[PDB]
Amino acid sequence: GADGVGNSSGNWHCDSQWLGDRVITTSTRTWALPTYNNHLYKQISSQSGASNDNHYFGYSTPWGYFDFNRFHCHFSPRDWQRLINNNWGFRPKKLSFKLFNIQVKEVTQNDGTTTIANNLTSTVQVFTDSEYQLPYVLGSAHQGCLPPFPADVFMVPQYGYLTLNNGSQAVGRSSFYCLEYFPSQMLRTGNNFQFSYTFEDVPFHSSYAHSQSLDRLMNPLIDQYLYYLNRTQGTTSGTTNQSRLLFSQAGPQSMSLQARNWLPGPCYRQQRLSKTANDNNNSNFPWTAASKYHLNGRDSLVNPGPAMASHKDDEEKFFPMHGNLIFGKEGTTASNAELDNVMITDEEEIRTTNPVATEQYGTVANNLQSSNTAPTTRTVNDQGALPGMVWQDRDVYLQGPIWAKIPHTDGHFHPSPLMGGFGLKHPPPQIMIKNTPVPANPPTTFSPAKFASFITQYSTGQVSVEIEWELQKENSKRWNPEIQYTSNYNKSVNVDFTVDTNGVYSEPRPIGTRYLTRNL
Amino acid sequence: QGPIWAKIPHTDGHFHPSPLMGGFGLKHPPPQIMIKNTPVPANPPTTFSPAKFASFITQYS
Amino acid sequence: DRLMNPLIDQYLYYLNRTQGTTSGTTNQSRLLFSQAGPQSMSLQARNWLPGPCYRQQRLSK
């Protein structure tokens, strides 16, 4: 693709249409790119004795990058509703990336006024980490994605990565990556950038909730043919009746004693919190009493753990200590914001396959009972994996992460990103972008010294992203209507998912995905 | 006299999908075969009644 | 107006009593609804209207 100055290098493709078996979303946004790090690679690390479990070492690059690992980058609210309310599941298929209508602007502070002018001969550099040789910094819920609202212009994030570290110091096996050591396409105004990607085979997401329960699985009307022991001593308690071994045949009556075929999913107990700031202990325990793990003598918070339900029946006020994902409302400090300023996600559809996050797991025996010894019971707060266990995964939300790169290790278990979504061995590659350095006035005499005098300039253009989604259609013989997402028909102030009096788009609530029901 | 197979629950995750009571765990097991006697109404009224029909001939198969 | 079935009642309901109730003690008014019947023949729900009109004066021979 090569055209002229007064000729656009692309069009605005922002649309979505459905094919009953699949859906194609196209999304275009305007982007702006500054000059990060002053065209310099800078070594970064932790403050000399500021914190210990936060010690780190890495580098900062003059490169920006494109991100669209959020669902609202592609699905308008209305669309998300169509998807959510009609499909057993869904997944990604293809991807088309396009950069175009590029403009390079250089600015000058002459006196007390900034003039901005065109630098037509200036270039910009783009490339894609398709061999995954660069540290994958996406799928970490960072900021700088495409604006949920198409009319919103966004700033392109800067690229930085972390390496291996011993405290604030580094090791010998630490890796330094130069992005100038990658072949990249240079673009002038009227040039453009093309890219296509094909997702791998990754299971459909669960856009459903089970209409049955792991324990309420059998026939309510018939008794089993298996027997269990329910009386150890209790007999005809009158004369000469100390103890006896008695067995009962399973019945719809003994519903939680019947022989079973499957187990609930794994668990890692979280601490229970209440939204009412007075049910809780008068202490500050978000760290000393929260669940966590430690690698190399460094404690890390187990924020979203295994998929566990948020609360039990008849509660809805108790949420796991960070046992779920939380989104911040529009306009809310990054530092200690009120509970009325955030949006907490309820995972109450998986109550049927998974243990509750705050509750125990079950009961294990740990002794050899006899006439001499009384049988001991121990509450299990942590459960690894077991043959027979089944479970559901974390939901995805309109503004949640989509995919995540699966770490290249010797072993994985259930490679589903813990924050939710699609785990990929080879995910959509990273797209790097940066303004090419333009030297300012050079000396008539030759100076070997590092060149530091540059013309200040930023870039702007459009970006387009087209993704094809495969849908799993609903096939239910449920007679009664199912629950659907819907807006309040009530006379309301502002309209949900809209701009306000002074033009600011805002998403009212987090949107789940499990509205339709399937059987176990 | 034990169980033979068992349907594997349609969830996001399983581990070792062998039925815990023993046997063969199947994603798609032998389907359920339903059977029932078709309702045979008894003497109807010469006058039209909208009310739910409840008078049936008792019979087994 | 004589278009429906003389033998069967409708499944639609109309309001035919606004006050008239068990007119004895403490019975001023109440909202009561009756299901259309061959009996309530000119009260039943309808599907069509008669033609337009422009009243003329009446004369006798």
Ligand SMILES: Nc1ncnc2c1ncn2[C@H]1C[C@H](O)[C@@H](COP(=O)(O)O)O1
């Ligand atoms: N998001 C995602 N990506 C890939 N696989 C998933 C995902 N979620 C669940 N699984 C399941 C599907 C396969 O049966 C299994 C492969 O594990 P393996 O370790 O590859 O043998 O992991």
Ligand SMILES: Nc1ncnc2c1ncn2[C@H]1C[C@H](O)[C@@H](COP(=O)(O)O)O1
């Ligand atoms: N009864 C029964 N049915 C199916 N598979 C069984 C059974 N017993 C053991 N396995 C083993 C065989 C496969 O290697 C594995 C597939 O797990 P998956 O979760 O399918 O990846 O589970």
